[PDB]
Amino acid sequence: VDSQAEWYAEYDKLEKARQKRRIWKWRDSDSRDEYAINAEEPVIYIR
Amino acid sequence: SGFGLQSGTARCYDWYMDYLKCMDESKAPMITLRKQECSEWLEDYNECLHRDKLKLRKLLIEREKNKQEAA
């Protein structure tokens, strides 16, 4: 039972989850009309 | 729509398409910004639709003509 390893592993897991959450929270508008904010996105419109 | 009544396209379709092309050229990250950059084209489309400037000009000419006639 290596307590130091367990503590560091748990802290790392929580920190990775926090980072992933913050990356996930970066969300631009996904509106089809809003072409300006999403100019680089590859979309095809059938209209 | 954009289609004309008899054929072709609407009376002011080309002015609107000009404004849309200008907005497409612009690189502004928001639509509001692009409309601000392309406002002059919108003013041209509105001018063709209603002829408000020509109506004002005619009103001023008529009013001055009336003033000259009365004098």
Side-chain angles (χ1 to χ4, degrees):
Chain A
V1 292
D2 178 17
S3 296
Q4 186 168 38
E6 281 176 42
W7 168 263
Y8 282 131
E10 295 279 349
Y11 162 86
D12 285 330
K13 289 182 181 179
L14 304 165
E15 182 65 25
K16 298 190 208 263
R18 186 273 303 278
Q19 294 179 356
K20 185 174 186 238
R21 179 133 49 249
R22 296 201 71 88
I23 298 164
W24 182 248
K25 299 289 94 175
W26 201 103
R27 293 180 181 177
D28 270 0
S29 175
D30 63 358
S31 297
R32 69 160 155 249
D33 283 26
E34 182 65 26
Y35 69 96
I37 297 169
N38 299 314
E40 65 272 16
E41 316 302 306
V43 66
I44 295 158
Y45 308 91
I46 306 99
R47 73 158 269 172
Chain B
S1 181
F3 293 84
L5 183 62
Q6 273 297 112
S7 70
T9 42
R11 82 159 147 105
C12 274
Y13 162 86
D14 297 314
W15 286 256
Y16 186 60
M17 275 293 271
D18 267 354
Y19 164 76
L20 292 174
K21 186 177 184 293
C22 203
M23 292 177 70
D24 214 49
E25 297 294 328
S26 293
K27 315 266 167 283
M30 270 176 315
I31 289 315
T32 61
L33 279 296
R34 280 152 199 231
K35 298 164 140 49
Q36 292 178 356
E37 291 179 353
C38 317
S39 47
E40 190 276 331
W41 297 90
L42 204 43
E43 293 176 349
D44 291 331
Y45 174 50
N46 298 323
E47 190 276 331
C48 79
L49 280 183
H50 308 315
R51 266 78 189 275
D52 283 335
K53 290 180 176 67
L54 293 174
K55 277 166 183 43
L56 171 82
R57 257 179 81 89
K58 275 326 289 192
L59 271 186
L60 305 165
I61 297 167
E62 168 178 1
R63 181 209 58 185
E64 180 63 26
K65 205 190 67 179
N66 297 342
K67 188 180 289 293
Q68 289 161 358
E69 285 299 314

PDB file of all heavy atoms in Angstrom, chain A residues 15-47:
ATOM      1  N   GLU A  15      -7.298  16.337 -11.696  1.00  0.00           N
ATOM      2  CA  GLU A  15      -6.806  17.463 -12.481  1.00  0.00           C
ATOM      3  C   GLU A  15      -7.083  17.245 -13.962  1.00  0.00           C
ATOM      4  O   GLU A  15      -7.464  18.182 -14.676  1.00  0.00           O
ATOM      5  CB  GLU A  15      -5.308  17.652 -12.231  1.00  0.00           C
ATOM      6  CG  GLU A  15      -4.684  18.823 -12.965  1.00  0.00           C
ATOM      7  CD  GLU A  15      -5.220  20.161 -12.508  1.00  0.00           C
ATOM      8  OE1 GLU A  15      -5.690  20.260 -11.355  1.00  0.00           O
ATOM      9  OE2 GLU A  15      -5.175  21.119 -13.307  1.00  0.00           O
ATOM     10  N   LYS A  16      -6.918  16.008 -14.436  1.00  0.00           N
ATOM     11  CA  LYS A  16      -7.221  15.710 -15.828  1.00  0.00           C
ATOM     12  C   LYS A  16      -8.700  15.920 -16.097  1.00  0.00           C
ATOM     13  O   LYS A  16      -9.079  16.449 -17.147  1.00  0.00           O
ATOM     14  CB  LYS A  16      -6.809  14.279 -16.176  1.00  0.00           C
ATOM     15  CG  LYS A  16      -5.325  13.999 -16.042  1.00  0.00           C
ATOM     16  CD  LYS A  16      -4.967  12.650 -16.642  1.00  0.00           C
ATOM     17  CE  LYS A  16      -3.749  12.047 -15.961  1.00  0.00           C
ATOM     18  NZ  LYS A  16      -2.495  12.309 -16.721  1.00  0.00           N
ATOM     19  N   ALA A  17      -9.556  15.492 -15.162  1.00  0.00           N
ATOM     20  CA  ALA A  17     -10.987  15.677 -15.360  1.00  0.00           C
ATOM     21  C   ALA A  17     -11.333  17.160 -15.412  1.00  0.00           C
ATOM     22  O   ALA A  17     -12.157  17.582 -16.232  1.00  0.00           O
ATOM     23  CB  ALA A  17     -11.767  14.977 -14.248  1.00  0.00           C
ATOM     24  N   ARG A  18     -10.709  17.967 -14.546  1.00  0.00           N
ATOM     25  CA  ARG A  18     -10.990  19.401 -14.550  1.00  0.00           C
ATOM     26  C   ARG A  18     -10.565  20.019 -15.877  1.00  0.00           C
ATOM     27  O   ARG A  18     -11.282  20.854 -16.448  1.00  0.00           O
ATOM     28  CB  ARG A  18     -10.305  20.094 -13.365  1.00  0.00           C
ATOM     29  CG  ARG A  18     -10.671  21.579 -13.211  1.00  0.00           C
ATOM     30  CD  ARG A  18      -9.820  22.549 -14.019  1.00  0.00           C
ATOM     31  NE  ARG A  18      -8.397  22.442 -13.728  1.00  0.00           N
ATOM     32  CZ  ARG A  18      -7.811  23.027 -12.694  1.00  0.00           C
ATOM     33  NH1 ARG A  18      -8.496  23.767 -11.840  1.00  0.00           N
ATOM     34  NH2 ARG A  18      -6.501  22.881 -12.521  1.00  0.00           N
ATOM     35  N   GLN A  19      -9.396  19.612 -16.386  1.00  0.00           N
ATOM     36  CA  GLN A  19      -8.919  20.157 -17.652  1.00  0.00           C
ATOM     37  C   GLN A  19      -9.862  19.770 -18.778  1.00  0.00           C
ATOM     38  O   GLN A  19     -10.198  20.597 -19.637  1.00  0.00           O
ATOM     39  CB  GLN A  19      -7.510  19.644 -17.945  1.00  0.00           C
ATOM     40  CG  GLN A  19      -6.451  20.138 -16.985  1.00  0.00           C
ATOM     41  CD  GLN A  19      -5.077  19.590 -17.301  1.00  0.00           C
ATOM     42  OE1 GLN A  19      -4.912  18.776 -18.210  1.00  0.00           O
ATOM     43  NE2 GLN A  19      -4.077  20.033 -16.548  1.00  0.00           N
ATOM     44  N   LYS A  20     -10.290  18.505 -18.794  1.00  0.00           N
ATOM     45  CA  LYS A  20     -11.178  18.040 -19.847  1.00  0.00           C
ATOM     46  C   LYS A  20     -12.491  18.803 -19.786  1.00  0.00           C
ATOM     47  O   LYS A  20     -13.085  19.126 -20.821  1.00  0.00           O
ATOM     48  CB  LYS A  20     -11.404  16.536 -19.708  1.00  0.00           C
ATOM     49  CG  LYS A  20     -12.217  15.907 -20.817  1.00  0.00           C
ATOM     50  CD  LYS A  20     -12.255  14.400 -20.650  1.00  0.00           C
ATOM     51  CE  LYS A  20     -12.933  13.728 -21.827  1.00  0.00           C
ATOM     52  NZ  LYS A  20     -14.093  12.914 -21.381  1.00  0.00           N
ATOM     53  N   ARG A  21     -12.956  19.101 -18.570  1.00  0.00           N
ATOM     54  CA  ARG A  21     -14.202  19.836 -18.406  1.00  0.00           C
ATOM     55  C   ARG A  21     -14.065  21.238 -18.978  1.00  0.00           C
ATOM     56  O   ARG A  21     -14.936  21.710 -19.714  1.00  0.00           O
ATOM     57  CB  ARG A  21     -14.585  19.900 -16.929  1.00  0.00           C
ATOM     58  CG  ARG A  21     -15.869  20.663 -16.658  1.00  0.00           C
ATOM     59  CD  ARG A  21     -16.794  19.899 -15.727  1.00  0.00           C
ATOM     60  NE  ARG A  21     -16.095  19.417 -14.541  1.00  0.00           N
ATOM     61  CZ  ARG A  21     -15.833  18.142 -14.292  1.00  0.00           C
ATOM     62  NH1 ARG A  21     -16.196  17.185 -15.128  1.00  0.00           N
ATOM     63  NH2 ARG A  21     -15.184  17.820 -13.177  1.00  0.00           N
ATOM     64  N   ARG A  22     -12.955  21.914 -18.661  1.00  0.00           N
ATOM     65  CA  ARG A  22     -12.761  23.278 -19.146  1.00  0.00           C
ATOM     66  C   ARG A  22     -12.658  23.303 -20.665  1.00  0.00           C
ATOM     67  O   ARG A  22     -13.152  24.232 -21.313  1.00  0.00           O
ATOM     68  CB  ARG A  22     -11.532  23.904 -18.492  1.00  0.00           C
ATOM     69  CG  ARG A  22     -11.688  24.071 -16.993  1.00  0.00           C
ATOM     70  CD  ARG A  22     -10.748  25.118 -16.438  1.00  0.00           C
ATOM     71  NE  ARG A  22     -11.137  26.467 -16.830  1.00  0.00           N
ATOM     72  CZ  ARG A  22     -11.992  27.224 -16.157  1.00  0.00           C
ATOM     73  NH1 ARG A  22     -12.579  26.791 -15.056  1.00  0.00           N
ATOM     74  NH2 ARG A  22     -12.257  28.449 -16.597  1.00  0.00           N
ATOM     75  N   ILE A  23     -12.000  22.300 -21.249  1.00  0.00           N
ATOM     76  CA  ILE A  23     -11.929  22.203 -22.706  1.00  0.00           C
ATOM     77  C   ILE A  23     -13.328  22.000 -23.277  1.00  0.00           C
ATOM     78  O   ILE A  23     -13.703  22.601 -24.291  1.00  0.00           O
ATOM     79  CB  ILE A  23     -10.967  21.081 -23.137  1.00  0.00           C
ATOM     80  CG1 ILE A  23      -9.549  21.370 -22.641  1.00  0.00           C
ATOM     81  CG2 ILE A  23     -10.978  20.916 -24.646  1.00  0.00           C
ATOM     82  CD1 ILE A  23      -8.635  20.166 -22.671  1.00  0.00           C
ATOM     83  N   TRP A  24     -14.116  21.145 -22.625  1.00  0.00           N
ATOM     84  CA  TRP A  24     -15.494  20.888 -23.028  1.00  0.00           C
ATOM     85  C   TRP A  24     -16.355  22.146 -22.922  1.00  0.00           C
ATOM     86  O   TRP A  24     -17.247  22.364 -23.748  1.00  0.00           O
ATOM     87  CB  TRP A  24     -16.053  19.761 -22.159  1.00  0.00           C
ATOM     88  CG  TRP A  24     -17.444  19.326 -22.462  1.00  0.00           C
ATOM     89  CD1 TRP A  24     -18.540  19.488 -21.670  1.00  0.00           C
ATOM     90  CD2 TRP A  24     -17.886  18.605 -23.616  1.00  0.00           C
ATOM     91  NE1 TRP A  24     -19.642  18.933 -22.269  1.00  0.00           N
ATOM     92  CE2 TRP A  24     -19.268  18.385 -23.467  1.00  0.00           C
ATOM     93  CE3 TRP A  24     -17.250  18.134 -24.769  1.00  0.00           C
ATOM     94  CZ2 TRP A  24     -20.025  17.716 -24.425  1.00  0.00           C
ATOM     95  CZ3 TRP A  24     -18.003  17.470 -25.717  1.00  0.00           C
ATOM     96  CH2 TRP A  24     -19.375  17.268 -25.541  1.00  0.00           C
ATOM     97  N   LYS A  25     -16.107  22.983 -21.910  1.00  0.00           N
ATOM     98  CA  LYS A  25     -16.890  24.198 -21.691  1.00  0.00           C
ATOM     99  C   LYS A  25     -16.613  25.290 -22.717  1.00  0.00           C
ATOM    100  O   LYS A  25     -17.351  26.281 -22.748  1.00  0.00           O
ATOM    101  CB  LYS A  25     -16.642  24.762 -20.288  1.00  0.00           C
ATOM    102  CG  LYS A  25     -17.023  23.859 -19.114  1.00  0.00           C
ATOM    103  CD  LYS A  25     -18.533  23.701 -18.941  1.00  0.00           C
ATOM    104  CE  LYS A  25     -19.080  22.472 -19.650  1.00  0.00           C
ATOM    105  NZ  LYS A  25     -20.529  22.286 -19.373  1.00  0.00           N
ATOM    106  N   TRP A  26     -15.577  25.152 -23.539  1.00  0.00           N
ATOM    107  CA  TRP A  26     -15.315  26.093 -24.628  1.00  0.00           C
ATOM    108  C   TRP A  26     -16.200  25.695 -25.803  1.00  0.00           C
ATOM    109  O   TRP A  26     -15.877  24.776 -26.558  1.00  0.00           O
ATOM    110  CB  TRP A  26     -13.839  26.066 -25.007  1.00  0.00           C
ATOM    111  CG  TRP A  26     -13.357  27.284 -25.732  1.00  0.00           C
ATOM    112  CD1 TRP A  26     -12.623  28.305 -25.209  1.00  0.00           C
ATOM    113  CD2 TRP A  26     -13.578  27.613 -27.108  1.00  0.00           C
ATOM    114  NE1 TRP A  26     -12.368  29.248 -26.171  1.00  0.00           N
ATOM    115  CE2 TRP A  26     -12.944  28.847 -27.347  1.00  0.00           C
ATOM    116  CE3 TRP A  26     -14.248  26.984 -28.160  1.00  0.00           C
ATOM    117  CZ2 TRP A  26     -12.962  29.465 -28.594  1.00  0.00           C
ATOM    118  CZ3 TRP A  26     -14.265  27.600 -29.395  1.00  0.00           C
ATOM    119  CH2 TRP A  26     -13.626  28.827 -29.601  1.00  0.00           C
ATOM    120  N   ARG A  27     -17.324  26.394 -25.963  1.00  0.00           N
ATOM    121  CA  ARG A  27     -18.331  26.064 -26.966  1.00  0.00           C
ATOM    122  C   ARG A  27     -18.784  27.311 -27.708  1.00  0.00           C
ATOM    123  O   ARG A  27     -19.358  28.220 -27.101  1.00  0.00           O
ATOM    124  CB  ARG A  27     -19.561  25.409 -26.331  1.00  0.00           C
ATOM    125  CG  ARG A  27     -19.387  24.035 -25.730  1.00  0.00           C
ATOM    126  CD  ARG A  27     -20.734  23.608 -25.168  1.00  0.00           C
ATOM    127  NE  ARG A  27     -20.730  22.299 -24.531  1.00  0.00           N
ATOM    128  CZ  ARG A  27     -21.786  21.769 -23.930  1.00  0.00           C
ATOM    129  NH1 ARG A  27     -22.943  22.407 -23.880  1.00  0.00           N
ATOM    130  NH2 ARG A  27     -21.682  20.567 -23.373  1.00  0.00           N
ATOM    131  N   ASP A  28     -18.523  27.359 -29.012  1.00  0.00           N
ATOM    132  CA  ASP A  28     -19.038  28.459 -29.810  1.00  0.00           C
ATOM    133  C   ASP A  28     -20.478  28.154 -30.215  1.00  0.00           C
ATOM    134  O   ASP A  28     -20.989  27.052 -30.000  1.00  0.00           O
ATOM    135  CB  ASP A  28     -18.182  28.681 -31.057  1.00  0.00           C
ATOM    136  CG  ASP A  28     -17.054  29.654 -30.824  1.00  0.00           C
ATOM    137  OD1 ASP A  28     -16.933  30.157 -29.694  1.00  0.00           O
ATOM    138  OD2 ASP A  28     -16.290  29.920 -31.775  1.00  0.00           O
ATOM    139  N   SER A  29     -21.143  29.144 -30.803  1.00  0.00           N
ATOM    140  CA  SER A  29     -22.490  28.906 -31.304  1.00  0.00           C
ATOM    141  C   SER A  29     -22.454  27.891 -32.440  1.00  0.00           C
ATOM    142  O   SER A  29     -21.594  27.954 -33.322  1.00  0.00           O
ATOM    143  CB  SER A  29     -23.119  30.213 -31.780  1.00  0.00           C
ATOM    144  OG  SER A  29     -24.386  29.982 -32.371  1.00  0.00           O
ATOM    145  N   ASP A  30     -23.400  26.955 -32.420  1.00  0.00           N
ATOM    146  CA  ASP A  30     -23.511  25.948 -33.465  1.00  0.00           C
ATOM    147  C   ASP A  30     -24.634  26.244 -34.451  1.00  0.00           C
ATOM    148  O   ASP A  30     -25.028  25.353 -35.209  1.00  0.00           O
ATOM    149  CB  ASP A  30     -23.694  24.560 -32.844  1.00  0.00           C
ATOM    150  CG  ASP A  30     -24.975  24.439 -32.033  1.00  0.00           C
ATOM    151  OD1 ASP A  30     -25.716  25.435 -31.907  1.00  0.00           O
ATOM    152  OD2 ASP A  30     -25.242  23.332 -31.518  1.00  0.00           O
ATOM    153  N   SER A  31     -25.166  27.465 -34.441  1.00  0.00           N
ATOM    154  CA  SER A  31     -26.281  27.809 -35.310  1.00  0.00           C
ATOM    155  C   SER A  31     -25.904  27.626 -36.773  1.00  0.00           C
ATOM    156  O   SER A  31     -24.800  27.982 -37.194  1.00  0.00           O
ATOM    157  CB  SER A  31     -26.718  29.251 -35.057  1.00  0.00           C
ATOM    158  OG  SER A  31     -27.192  29.414 -33.733  1.00  0.00           O
ATOM    159  N   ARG A  32     -26.824  27.052 -37.552  1.00  0.00           N
ATOM    160  CA  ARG A  32     -26.572  26.910 -38.981  1.00  0.00           C
ATOM    161  C   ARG A  32     -26.438  28.276 -39.645  1.00  0.00           C
ATOM    162  O   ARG A  32     -25.607  28.463 -40.541  1.00  0.00           O
ATOM    163  CB  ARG A  32     -27.680  26.082 -39.639  1.00  0.00           C
ATOM    164  CG  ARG A  32     -29.037  26.767 -39.712  1.00  0.00           C
ATOM    165  CD  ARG A  32     -29.932  26.146 -40.769  1.00  0.00           C
ATOM    166  NE  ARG A  32     -31.342  26.367 -40.470  1.00  0.00           N
ATOM    167  CZ  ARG A  32     -32.188  25.414 -40.105  1.00  0.00           C
ATOM    168  NH1 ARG A  32     -31.800  24.156 -39.978  1.00  0.00           N
ATOM    169  NH2 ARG A  32     -33.454  25.734 -39.848  1.00  0.00           N
ATOM    170  N   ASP A  33     -27.258  29.241 -39.220  1.00  0.00           N
ATOM    171  CA  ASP A  33     -27.199  30.583 -39.786  1.00  0.00           C
ATOM    172  C   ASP A  33     -25.882  31.276 -39.461  1.00  0.00           C
ATOM    173  O   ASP A  33     -25.356  32.036 -40.282  1.00  0.00           O
ATOM    174  CB  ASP A  33     -28.374  31.415 -39.275  1.00  0.00           C
ATOM    175  CG  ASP A  33     -29.674  31.078 -39.973  1.00  0.00           C
ATOM    176  OD1 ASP A  33     -29.812  29.934 -40.454  1.00  0.00           O
ATOM    177  OD2 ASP A  33     -30.560  31.955 -40.038  1.00  0.00           O
ATOM    178  N   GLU A  34     -25.338  31.034 -38.267  1.00  0.00           N
ATOM    179  CA  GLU A  34     -24.137  31.729 -37.803  1.00  0.00           C
ATOM    180  C   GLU A  34     -22.896  31.178 -38.507  1.00  0.00           C
ATOM    181  O   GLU A  34     -22.113  30.396 -37.964  1.00  0.00           O
ATOM    182  CB  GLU A  34     -24.014  31.655 -36.288  1.00  0.00           C
ATOM    183  CG  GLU A  34     -22.812  32.418 -35.790  1.00  0.00           C
ATOM    184  CD  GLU A  34     -22.953  33.907 -36.069  1.00  0.00           C
ATOM    185  OE1 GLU A  34     -24.101  34.385 -36.174  1.00  0.00           O
ATOM    186  OE2 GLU A  34     -21.923  34.597 -36.206  1.00  0.00           O
ATOM    187  N   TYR A  35     -22.745  31.585 -39.766  1.00  0.00           N
ATOM    188  CA  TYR A  35     -21.580  31.226 -40.568  1.00  0.00           C
ATOM    189  C   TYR A  35     -20.317  31.974 -40.141  1.00  0.00           C
ATOM    190  O   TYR A  35     -19.214  31.430 -40.264  1.00  0.00           O
ATOM    191  CB  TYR A  35     -21.890  31.434 -42.051  1.00  0.00           C
ATOM    192  CG  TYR A  35     -22.053  32.870 -42.488  1.00  0.00           C
ATOM    193  CD1 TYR A  35     -20.995  33.578 -43.043  1.00  0.00           C
ATOM    194  CD2 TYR A  35     -23.276  33.512 -42.365  1.00  0.00           C
ATOM    195  CE1 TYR A  35     -21.151  34.886 -43.450  1.00  0.00           C
ATOM    196  CE2 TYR A  35     -23.441  34.818 -42.769  1.00  0.00           C
ATOM    197  CZ  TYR A  35     -22.376  35.501 -43.308  1.00  0.00           C
ATOM    198  OH  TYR A  35     -22.539  36.805 -43.715  1.00  0.00           O
ATOM    199  N   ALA A  36     -20.448  33.214 -39.660  1.00  0.00           N
ATOM    200  CA  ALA A  36     -19.275  34.012 -39.297  1.00  0.00           C
ATOM    201  C   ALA A  36     -18.462  33.378 -38.171  1.00  0.00           C
ATOM    202  O   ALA A  36     -17.234  33.277 -38.269  1.00  0.00           O
ATOM    203  CB  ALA A  36     -19.706  35.420 -38.898  1.00  0.00           C
ATOM    204  N   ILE A  37     -19.114  32.957 -37.084  1.00  0.00           N
ATOM    205  CA  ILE A  37     -18.350  32.427 -35.957  1.00  0.00           C
ATOM    206  C   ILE A  37     -17.755  31.062 -36.282  1.00  0.00           C
ATOM    207  O   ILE A  37     -16.721  30.684 -35.718  1.00  0.00           O
ATOM    208  CB  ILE A  37     -19.234  32.351 -34.693  1.00  0.00           C
ATOM    209  CG1 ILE A  37     -19.691  33.744 -34.267  1.00  0.00           C
ATOM    210  CG2 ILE A  37     -18.504  31.689 -33.535  1.00  0.00           C
ATOM    211  CD1 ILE A  37     -20.759  33.735 -33.199  1.00  0.00           C
ATOM    212  N   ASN A  38     -18.348  30.334 -37.221  1.00  0.00           N
ATOM    213  CA  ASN A  38     -17.942  28.974 -37.545  1.00  0.00           C
ATOM    214  C   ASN A  38     -17.373  28.870 -38.958  1.00  0.00           C
ATOM    215  O   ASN A  38     -17.494  27.825 -39.594  1.00  0.00           O
ATOM    216  CB  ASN A  38     -19.124  28.021 -37.378  1.00  0.00           C
ATOM    217  CG  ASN A  38     -19.654  27.991 -35.962  1.00  0.00           C
ATOM    218  OD1 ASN A  38     -18.890  27.906 -35.000  1.00  0.00           O
ATOM    219  ND2 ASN A  38     -20.971  28.050 -35.826  1.00  0.00           N
ATOM    220  N   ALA A  39     -16.691  29.911 -39.439  1.00  0.00           N
ATOM    221  CA  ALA A  39     -16.258  29.934 -40.836  1.00  0.00           C
ATOM    222  C   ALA A  39     -15.371  28.744 -41.198  1.00  0.00           C
ATOM    223  O   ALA A  39     -15.520  28.166 -42.281  1.00  0.00           O
ATOM    224  CB  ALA A  39     -15.530  31.243 -41.129  1.00  0.00           C
ATOM    225  N   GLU A  40     -14.447  28.362 -40.322  1.00  0.00           N
ATOM    226  CA  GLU A  40     -13.524  27.277 -40.647  1.00  0.00           C
ATOM    227  C   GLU A  40     -14.158  25.885 -40.632  1.00  0.00           C
ATOM    228  O   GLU A  40     -13.524  24.940 -41.113  1.00  0.00           O
ATOM    229  CB  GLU A  40     -12.312  27.344 -39.717  1.00  0.00           C
ATOM    230  CG  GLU A  40     -12.603  27.092 -38.263  1.00  0.00           C
ATOM    231  CD  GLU A  40     -12.984  28.374 -37.549  1.00  0.00           C
ATOM    232  OE1 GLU A  40     -13.307  29.363 -38.237  1.00  0.00           O
ATOM    233  OE2 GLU A  40     -12.929  28.413 -36.309  1.00  0.00           O
ATOM    234  N   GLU A  41     -15.366  25.723 -40.097  1.00  0.00           N
ATOM    235  CA  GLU A  41     -15.946  24.390 -39.963  1.00  0.00           C
ATOM    236  C   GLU A  41     -16.334  23.812 -41.322  1.00  0.00           C
ATOM    237  O   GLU A  41     -16.846  24.531 -42.184  1.00  0.00           O
ATOM    238  CB  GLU A  41     -17.163  24.417 -39.044  1.00  0.00           C
ATOM    239  CG  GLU A  41     -16.931  25.232 -37.809  1.00  0.00           C
ATOM    240  CD  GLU A  41     -15.754  24.700 -37.032  1.00  0.00           C
ATOM    241  OE1 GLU A  41     -15.753  23.494 -36.717  1.00  0.00           O
ATOM    242  OE2 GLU A  41     -14.820  25.474 -36.761  1.00  0.00           O
ATOM    243  N   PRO A  42     -16.101  22.510 -41.542  1.00  0.00           N
ATOM    244  CA  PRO A  42     -16.514  21.878 -42.801  1.00  0.00           C
ATOM    245  C   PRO A  42     -17.944  21.368 -42.772  1.00  0.00           C
ATOM    246  O   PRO A  42     -18.216  20.294 -42.228  1.00  0.00           O
ATOM    247  CB  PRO A  42     -15.523  20.712 -42.936  1.00  0.00           C
ATOM    248  CG  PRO A  42     -14.569  20.843 -41.728  1.00  0.00           C
ATOM    249  CD  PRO A  42     -15.381  21.548 -40.705  1.00  0.00           C
ATOM    250  N   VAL A  43     -18.866  22.133 -43.346  1.00  0.00           N
ATOM    251  CA  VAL A  43     -20.273  21.770 -43.382  1.00  0.00           C
ATOM    252  C   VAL A  43     -20.789  21.836 -44.814  1.00  0.00           C
ATOM    253  O   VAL A  43     -20.301  22.621 -45.635  1.00  0.00           O
ATOM    254  CB  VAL A  43     -21.101  22.701 -42.486  1.00  0.00           C
ATOM    255  CG1 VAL A  43     -21.054  24.052 -43.058  1.00  0.00           C
ATOM    256  CG2 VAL A  43     -22.503  22.231 -42.359  1.00  0.00           C
ATOM    257  N   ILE A  44     -21.761  20.986 -45.125  1.00  0.00           N
ATOM    258  CA  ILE A  44     -22.428  20.994 -46.421  1.00  0.00           C
ATOM    259  C   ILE A  44     -23.905  21.236 -46.150  1.00  0.00           C
ATOM    260  O   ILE A  44     -24.500  20.551 -45.309  1.00  0.00           O
ATOM    261  CB  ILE A  44     -22.221  19.669 -47.176  1.00  0.00           C
ATOM    262  CG1 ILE A  44     -20.745  19.476 -47.519  1.00  0.00           C
ATOM    263  CG2 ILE A  44     -23.077  19.632 -48.430  1.00  0.00           C
ATOM    264  CD1 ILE A  44     -20.373  18.038 -47.757  1.00  0.00           C
ATOM    265  N   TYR A  45     -24.504  22.200 -46.848  1.00  0.00           N
ATOM    266  CA  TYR A  45     -25.922  22.487 -46.677  1.00  0.00           C
ATOM    267  C   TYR A  45     -26.726  21.987 -47.866  1.00  0.00           C
ATOM    268  O   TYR A  45     -26.425  22.335 -49.013  1.00  0.00           O
ATOM    269  CB  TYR A  45     -26.188  23.988 -46.521  1.00  0.00           C
ATOM    270  CG  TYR A  45     -25.392  24.716 -45.465  1.00  0.00           C
ATOM    271  CD1 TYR A  45     -24.181  25.317 -45.771  1.00  0.00           C
ATOM    272  CD2 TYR A  45     -25.871  24.831 -44.168  1.00  0.00           C
ATOM    273  CE1 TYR A  45     -23.459  25.996 -44.812  1.00  0.00           C
ATOM    274  CE2 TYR A  45     -25.155  25.505 -43.202  1.00  0.00           C
ATOM    275  CZ  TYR A  45     -23.951  26.086 -43.529  1.00  0.00           C
ATOM    276  OH  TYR A  45     -23.236  26.759 -42.566  1.00  0.00           O
ATOM    277  N   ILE A  46     -27.740  21.178 -47.593  1.00  0.00           N
ATOM    278  CA  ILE A  46     -28.705  20.756 -48.599  1.00  0.00           C
ATOM    279  C   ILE A  46     -29.958  21.575 -48.333  1.00  0.00           C
ATOM    280  O   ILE A  46     -30.636  21.361 -47.324  1.00  0.00           O
ATOM    281  CB  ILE A  46     -28.990  19.250 -48.535  1.00  0.00           C
ATOM    282  CG1 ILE A  46     -27.692  18.446 -48.623  1.00  0.00           C
ATOM    283  CG2 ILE A  46     -29.944  18.846 -49.646  1.00  0.00           C
ATOM    284  CD1 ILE A  46     -27.166  17.977 -47.284  1.00  0.00           C
ATOM    285  N   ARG A  47     -30.292  22.513 -49.213  1.00  0.00           N
ATOM    286  CA  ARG A  47     -31.396  23.406 -48.901  1.00  0.00           C
ATOM    287  C   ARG A  47     -32.235  23.679 -50.138  1.00  0.00           C
ATOM    288  O   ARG A  47     -31.785  23.522 -51.275  1.00  0.00           O
ATOM    289  CB  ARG A  47     -30.905  24.725 -48.286  1.00  0.00           C
ATOM    290  CG  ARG A  47     -30.238  25.682 -49.245  1.00  0.00           C
ATOM    291  CD  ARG A  47     -30.292  27.087 -48.682  1.00  0.00           C
ATOM    292  NE  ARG A  47     -31.486  27.800 -49.117  1.00  0.00           N
ATOM    293  CZ  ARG A  47     -31.865  28.981 -48.650  1.00  0.00           C
ATOM    294  NH1 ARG A  47     -31.169  29.612 -47.719  1.00  0.00           N
ATOM    295  NH2 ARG A  47     -32.972  29.543 -49.126  1.00  0.00           N
TER     296      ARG A  47
END
